[PDB]
Amino acid sequence: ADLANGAKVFSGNCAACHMGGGNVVMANKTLKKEALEQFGMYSEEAIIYQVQHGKNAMPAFAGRLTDEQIQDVAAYVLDQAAKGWV
Ligand code: HEC
Numbered sequence: 001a002d003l004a005n006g007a008k009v010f011s012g013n014c015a016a017c018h019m020g021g022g023n024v025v026m027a028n029k030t031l032k033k034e035a036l037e038q039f040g041m042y043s044e045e046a047i048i049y050q051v052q053h054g055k056n057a058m059p060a061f062a063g064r065l066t067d068e069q070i071q072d073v074a075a076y077v078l079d080q081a082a083k084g085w086v
């Protein structure tokens with residue numbers, strides 16, 4: 001993946017909800033590593049899935065973002081989570 005492209009994707013499409021790695025809609029479902037691991041979401045393929053199909057209040061991004069942008073944002077989120085948010 002292109003992590004830098006991911007970050008741009010994130011900025012425009014994900015951070016209105018996941019501001020600085022949080023979650024303004026459902027405050028237990030953050031992008032922090034510990035949180036992701038609690039729900040079996042700390043993997044590229046898990047995130048790609050979720051971004052593609054949505055879940056509840058999280059919008060689906062299928063055929064709004066390209067395949068490459070969805071891969072790249074997933075890779076960005078895991079890499080930010082691993083480094084630490086904010
Ligand atoms: C508000 C309109 C959101 C936008 C825009 C995006 N996400 Fe989201 N996300 C949101 C909610 C309310 C939830 C909880 C859904 C549920 O009921 O379980 C989530 C969850 C995720 C997760 C999982 C987090 C975890 O389990 O701790 C990930 C990894 C995730 N969201 C990533 C993400 C990406 C990369 C986004 C943009 C492309 C994105 N989300 C948008 C709400 C919202």
Ligand code: NA
Binds near residue numbers: 044074075
């Ligand atoms: Na990855």
